[PDB]
DNA sequence: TTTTGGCACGTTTC
DNA sequence: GAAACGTGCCAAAA
C-alpha cells in the first residue's frame, strides 16, 4: 500500500465532484492529475477505486 | 474519439 | 481456502 487508507480514494470523487460536474474526468485523466499532487497512483488502481467507492465512470453521473 | 475491465504477482491476515 | 493493497500486460465496446 503505497498510499494511505484512501489518499486517492476520497480524492477521485472528492475532487472530481468539486470541479466540473458537466465535465467528468477519466480514470486515466484523474490518475494523471493525481500523479501531479502526490498520489502517483496508476490508472489501474484509480479505475478500480472509482468503482469501489460508488462511481461507474463519472461519465454516467454527468449524463 | 473516449472509457473501462480481467488476471496475477509480491505482501499480509484470517 | 479467501480477501485486499498497487501495478505489469492485454483486450473489449461505443
From TrEMBL:
<comment type="similarity">
    <text>Belongs to the sigma-54 factor family.</text>
</comment>
<protein>
    <submittedName>
        <fullName>RNA polymerase sigma factor RpoN</fullName>
    </submittedName>
</protein>
